[PDB]
Each structure stands twice: as structure tokens, then as C-alpha cells.
DNA sequence: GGGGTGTGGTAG
DNA sequence: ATCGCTACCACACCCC
């Protein structure tokens, strides 16, 4: 049942299993629905329009999903009771899910079982269950369904496969309150609950993306948060981390608790910054959106969402990327792989019926010091990163053209075989095919 | 003013 | 064991 990665299942068997490739896959499918449910309408947000924000988002999704699908081996498990896990493995295996039990114990998505087991006090013991990727799929499904049926929004924007920004556009005609906003997400949380057989979404509400976001994070688990920029107080900005701001993610965050003598919530940093330190810090157009977003504000580019989804939701580029398992002895190996990924592209391409006229090989090459077995079996562990780029001219879907010049892109980065870690195949500029193709 | 490249970082 | 994907904005540093 085992499939290496100089098999020619190893793709397929790795995406089936992979969360993360099926995290990118639902939200491209999400990205074409909305495209093709919207090529003749015209719903979109104009300078004319006052709007609320619904974000709404599942609780510990694949935790949530996979309790209410599991086995009978796990008949007995609590989920009110017992921290419970969504992964693979048993040590160095990531928890793609935690609910909110174990959250209490200091776990976190993403930790390694092997770090979250250290965690739970002695006689505490740790549930791990599958994965049931249909099923997540399902209840999605079941989620997107229901918001259209409710027809409370006049737009609705994927975000995952678990999370959804809905607008509700408020004529100047209407008198917008927080009991009526309260009763919308009360019925939203309730008819999700019912629709997908008992998973729980909480809800940001406000009249803007980031503090919808916001009021999400102070939402959860299981509840909603009103905030709009009229109620904003010292409390609410004292309730965050500076991690909670979007587009703030590690680097970031260092990079600001550098600058600003280690601020502890978004208080300690609103009161103590300046646009121009700010800038200085994290960079001219992030450090904008944190100052406006400190505001309660969104962003130009945040806001392109809203007022042109075609355009941000259209695929502007096509990848895969490959940075487990891989093992190769030698360069025939390697080609073929490459070429097995270009053949998936392209179908991937083709279905889209586009061209394209630049493409990129990345490659992860273990560091010199670097064991040749990393502690997570078959990870990249510690690599260095090397990427080139080629421009083809003609735009093309030939997978002549395209494999030839990926194994020479290979080939001008210098990466032994057996030091190879991990590969990324690019289509970088896709060009539409038209019913003229006279040359 | 226009173009390019590889790299960093974040989102989900 | 264990499945560390992928799209896209922003930036620094080059060309004219
Ligand atoms: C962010 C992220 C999510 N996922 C999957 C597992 C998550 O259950 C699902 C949704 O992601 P999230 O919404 O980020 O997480 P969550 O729903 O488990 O928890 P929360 O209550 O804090 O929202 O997507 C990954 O597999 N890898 C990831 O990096
Ligand atoms: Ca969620
Ligand atoms: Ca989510
Ligand atoms: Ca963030």
C-alpha cells in the first residue's frame, strides 16, 4: 500500500492523502463555481452601496466533521470531553484539526501529535481520528447551499472550503440595527447546524472585511460578534494578538515586536505606533494596511474583493508543488517525475482552455548539514530553495515544449538527485485560447 | 515613465 | 511512519 515517489501512482496517492492539496483544490473549485454562476449576472458591490459584513466560518472544521463521521472504533469519544485530533501519524504528523477541548491544553493546529501529547496533563489522553476528506467536502457543500437559500446576502465570496464573506447591502430607506443583525446570524448559525447534521460556524459581523475578521476570532467557538466601527473601544483591540491582524504572520510579528518594544495585543500596538515607524518596520503598503486596519479599516487592495470578484477570483497562474516523499536515486528518475507533473498540469490547463507563455521549476535541495533523513519521515527537513524562470515565446499547452524545458530548468540548478527535496512546477502567465487561432 | 528577475511572506 | 499545497501580493534589485 506503500507508493514511492518513482512509482507512477505517487502523485495521485499523495494529493488523496495530502490536507493541504486539497485545501488549494476545493478553493480553486470554489474560485470556477462563483465564476461560472456569474458570468452573465452582474453582482457585485458599487460606490452606491452600504454594506455589512457576514463572515462566517466553521468551528474546528475537519475536527467538527470527522467526530460527527467517525467509525465505530471511536463510538465512545466525547466531543464536549475528550481533545480530540484530526492527522495521519502518531509522532512527527501534523494536527490538521483540534477542537476546542484540546485548544484548552495550549494545542494548536499544525503542532506535531509528538508536541501536542506534552501537553495534556497525566491521565488526559490524546483522541486521534482519520481524516474523511468526502465528508468534508459534503458538509461544505451542505454550508454553501444553505447560504444561498437563505437569500439574506447579495453576495456571497468563498473564502475555503469552511469559510464564506457575505455581503448584505442595507438601502438608505433602512433603519440596519443590532437586534436585526443578532437575529441574521442567530438564523444563519442555526440553519448551518441543521443543514450540515451538527457542525457549528461562528460569525463576524461589521461594515468592514477586518473587523468582520476580528469580530470572528472574538467570536469563537460557537457564537457571533458584532462590531462596528461606530462601537470600537479600548476592550475590543486589547482582545487580540498582533498575529490576529490579517496579512500579520510570523515574520511580521517579530518584525513588530522588534520595532515596538514587544506589544502584547492590538492596544498595546495601536497606542504605541506611527505610520511612518510602521512602515519602516514591516513595509510601505503592509504597513498601511496595518495602520487602517487599526482603524477599523480595509484596505484598497482588500477591498477589490468587493467591488470587482471576478477579477480577484480569476486564475492568474497554475502550480503543484511536491515537498514530501521526495527520494530519488538519480536523474532518469527525477525526469520522469517531471514529466509526470507536467502531464498533470496540463490537464489542468487544458481544462481551463488556456496557454501559457512562462514557467518556473523550484526545487528544495537539503542543506549541507542537514541530515539525509530529517526527523519527520520522508519531510524535506531543512533545505535551501532555488527557483528559475523561462519565458517561451509562443504561449503553449505542448507538453513537449513545456516537459523539455522544466528538465533543463532542473538541469540549471545543479541539484544532485539525491539531495533533492522537494519540486514545484509553475505555470506562471496563462493566455486564453479564442475562436480565432489563424495565427 | 516602462520592463524584467528571484525571493519573502501570508492565507486558507 | 506519514502525506510539509498553492495562489498571489509585495519587495529589492537589475534593464531601458
Ligand atoms: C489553515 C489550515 C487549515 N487546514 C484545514 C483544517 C481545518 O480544519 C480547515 C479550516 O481551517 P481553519 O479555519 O484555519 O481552522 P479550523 O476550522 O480547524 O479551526 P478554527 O475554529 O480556529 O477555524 O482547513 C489545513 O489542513 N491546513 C491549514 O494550514
Ligand atoms: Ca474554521
Ligand atoms: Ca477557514
Ligand atoms: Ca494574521
Redesign the pocket.
Known sequence: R?VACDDPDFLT???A?????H???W??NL?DKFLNENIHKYTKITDKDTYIIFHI?FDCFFATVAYLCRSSSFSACDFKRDPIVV????????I?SCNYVARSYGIKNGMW?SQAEKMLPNGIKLISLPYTFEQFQLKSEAFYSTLKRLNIFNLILP??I??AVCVRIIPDNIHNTNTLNARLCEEIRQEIFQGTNGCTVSIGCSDSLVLARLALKMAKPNGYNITFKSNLSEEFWSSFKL?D?????????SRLESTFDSPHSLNDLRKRYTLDALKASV????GMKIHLALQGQDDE?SLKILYDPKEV?????????????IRFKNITQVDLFIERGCQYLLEKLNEINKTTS?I?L?LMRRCKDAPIE????????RCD?????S?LGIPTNEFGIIATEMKSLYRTLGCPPMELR?L?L?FNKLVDVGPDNNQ
Open positions: 506503500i496517492s499523495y494529493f492523502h495530502s490536507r493541504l492539496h485545501l488549494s483544490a478553493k480553486a474560485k466560518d492527522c495521519h501519524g502518531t509522532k512527527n504528523s501534523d490538521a501529535v473564502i475555503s469552511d469559510e498575529d491582524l490579517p496579512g500579520v504572520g510570523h515574520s511580521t510579528l513595509g510601505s503598503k503592509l487592495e477570483l480569476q486564475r492568474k497562474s497554475l502550480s503543484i508543488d511536491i515537498n514530501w516523499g512562462q518556473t523550484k530529517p526527523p519527520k519521515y520522508m519531510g524535506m527537513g530553495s532555488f527557483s528559475r524562470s519565458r522537494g514545484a509553475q
